[PDB]
């Protein structure tokens, strides 16, 4: 985790060793599931590329630009998440439900 500041025109970057990040996996499927729309931001094809993580957003019922009464608003901080500092790591496992072989 790195802090970056601006003094006039110069830039400088430095470790912040106490800083954290927050990671949860939505395993109850309680959020708008936005994967599968073929958006950019996947891991690069080539293992030597460094990639920028895409921003999360979601769409809800509308009428015009206005919102209707069924429109949901989700606050992602309202889930349990795991806070990781520079020494910490994260893991989870997942098991696919039975699916027909892709017929190639």
């Amino acid at each position: 985790v790195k802090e970056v500041t601006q003094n006039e025109g110069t830039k400088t970057i430095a470790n912040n060793l106490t800083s954290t990040i927050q990671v949860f996996t939505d395993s109850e499927y309680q959020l708008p599931y936005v994967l599968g729309s073929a958006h950019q931001g996947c891991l690069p094809p080539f293992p030597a590329d460094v990639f920028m993580i895409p921003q999360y957003g979601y769409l809800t019922l509308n009428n015009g630009s206005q919102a209707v009464g069924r429109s949901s608003f989700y606050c992602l901080e309202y889930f349990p998440s795991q806070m990781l500092r520079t020494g910490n790591n994260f893991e989870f496992s997942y098991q696919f439900e039975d699916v027909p072989f892709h017929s190639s």
Binding site: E28, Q30, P32, Y33, G69, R70, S71, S72, F73, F79
Partner: protein, 104 residues
């Protein structure tokens, strides 16, 4: 079902009921014809039906409030879903089952 409902292959078995016919006095001399004169008769009673239901509890992280079914807060000549002056029960409006939300 296209009207809405639970399509069943073996639905609840239909229950049939009848007043057993009681003949009026037959003639004193035998006759082949069936007995065409009966006692005017009817029956009454009490019936009970008890259905156990299985519920799927709503589990959702939506932040903002849902839409609920609420009775009219404002005054009225008489309560809705209750008898009027003459004892006539009435149901003022059809009530559907979908007020909760999920993510599509």
């Amino acid at each position: 079902p296209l009207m809405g409902g639970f399509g069943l292959k073996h639905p609840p078995p239909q229950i049939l009921i009848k007043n057993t016919p009681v003949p009026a006095d037959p003639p004193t001399t035998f006759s082949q014809a069936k007995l065409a004169s009966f006692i005017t008769q009817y029956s009454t009673g009490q019936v009970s039906v008890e259905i156990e239901w299985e519920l799927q509890k709503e589990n959702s992280k939506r932040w903002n409030p849902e839409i609920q079914y609420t009775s009219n807060y404002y005054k009225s000549t008489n309560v809705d879903f209750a008898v009027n002056t003459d004892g006539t029960y009435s149901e003022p409006r059809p009530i559907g089952t979908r007020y909760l939300t999920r993510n599509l």
